Amino acid sequence: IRWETKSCQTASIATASASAQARNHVDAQVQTEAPVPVSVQPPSQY
Amino acid sequence: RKAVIKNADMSEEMQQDSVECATQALEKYNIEKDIAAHIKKEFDKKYNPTWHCIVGRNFGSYVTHETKHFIYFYLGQVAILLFKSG
């Protein structure tokens, strides 16, 4: 005959943002040098 | 699925049965509708009707229960409300 009223509640939760990324690239530039440290005719005496 | 009882108006024997019954339901069934159904049916059989069971991760309720037939507890992160009314 005794009806008791009760109130229930569950705990809340917490989320968080995040990200993923594959490997990254970057540019590059090269110029080949053309040095010619060469004389005309060295008179050798080997 | 560790059990922690938060509030009860229930005999110790029924409290233990609630935890063990809900634990079995949670091991066997993945979906709350089925977990709740398992738990409710076992109580109607053993402790007579009319039992009600709510199982979930996020809810509030306001209900009326019969004295000495109320328990609210967690299994891990899942809350189970088990009581008689009607």
Curated annotation (Swiss-Prot), chain A:
Localization (cell): Cytoplasm; Cytoplasm, Cytoskeleton, Cilium basal body; Cytoplasm, Cytoskeleton, Cilium axoneme; Cytoplasm, Cytoskeleton, Microtubule organizing center, Centrosome
Signal peptide: none
Tissue expression per record: Expressed in several cell lines (at protein level).
Residue ranges of the TM segments: none
Annotated region described as DYNLL2 binding, given as residue ranges: 23-36
Entry similarity comment: Belongs to the dynein light intermediate chain family.
Illness association: Short-rib thoracic dysplasia 11 with or without polydactyly: A form of short-rib thoracic dysplasia, a group of autosomal recessive ciliopathies that are characterized by a constricted thoracic cage, short ribs, shortened tubular bones, and a 'trident' appearance of the acetabular roof. Polydactyly is variably present. Non-skeletal involvement can include cleft lip/palate as well as anomalies of major organs such as the brain, eye, heart, kidneys, liver, pancreas, intestines, and genitalia.
Subunit-level organization: The cytoplasmic dynein 2 complex consists of two catalytic heavy chains (HCs) and a number of non-catalytic subunits presented by intermediate chains (ICs), light intermediate chains (LICs) and light chains (LCs). Among them, a heavy chain (DYNC2H1), two intermediate chains (DYNC2I2 and DYNC2I1), a light intermediate chain (DYNC2LI1), and a light chain (DYNLT2B) are unique to the cytoplasmic dynein complex 2, but a subset of the light chains are also shared by dynein-1 and dynein-2 complexes.
Record's function text: Acts as one of several non-catalytic accessory components of the cytoplasmic dynein 2 complex (dynein-2 complex), a motor protein complex that drives the movement of cargos along microtubules within cilia and flagella in concert with the intraflagellar transport (IFT) system. DYNC2I2 plays a major role in retrograde ciliary protein trafficking and in ciliogenesis. Required also to maintain a functional transition zone. Acts as a negative regulator of the Toll-like and IL-1R receptor signaling pathways. Inhibits the MAP3K7-induced NF-kappa-B activation pathway. Inhibits MAP3K7 phosphorylation at 'Thr-184' and 'Thr-187' upon Il-1 beta stimulation.
Protein name: Cytoplasmic dynein 2 intermediate chain 2
Higher taxonomy: Eukaryota, Metazoa, Chordata, Craniata, Vertebrata
Swiss-Prot record, chain B:
Main location: cytoplasm
Oxidoreductase listed as a keyword: no
Molecular function per GO: deoxyribonuclease inhibitor activity; dynein intermediate chain binding; enzyme binding; enzyme inhibitor activity; identical protein binding; nitric-oxide synthase inhibitor activity; protein-containing complex binding; scaffold protein binding
Post-translational modification: Phosphorylation at Ser-85 promotes recruitment to DNA double-strand breaks (DSBs) by TP53BP1 and ability to inhibit MRE11. Phosphorylation at Ser-85 appears to control the dimer-monomer transition. According to PubMed:15193260, it is phosphorylated at Ser-85 by PAK1, however, according to PubMed:18650427, the DYNLL1 dimer is not accessible for PAK1 and the phosphorylation could not be demonstrated in vitro.
Interaction with ESR1: annotated span: 64-86
GO biological process terms on file: apoptotic process; DNA damage response; intraciliary retrograde transport; motile cilium assembly; negative regulation of DNA strand resection involved in replication fork processing; negative regulation of nitric oxide biosynthetic process; negative regulation of phosphorylation; positive regulation of insulin secretion involved in cellular response to glucose stimulus
Pfam families linked to this entry: Dynein_light
Source organism superkingdom: Eukaryota
Protein's cellular compartments: Cytoplasm, Cytoskeleton, Microtubule organizing center, Centrosome; Chromosome; Cytoplasm, Cytoskeleton; Nucleus
Keyword tags: Acetylation, Activator, Apoptosis, Chromosome, Cytoplasm, Cytoskeleton, DNA damage, Dynein, Host-virus interaction, Isopeptide bond, Microtubule, Mitochondrion, Motor protein, Nucleus, Phosphoprotein, Transcription, Transcription regulation, Transport, Ubl conjugation
Keyword Ribosomal protein listed: no
Official protein name in the record: Dynein light chain 1, cytoplasmic
Organism of origin: Homo sapiens (Human)
Encoding gene, per UniProt annotation: DYNLL1
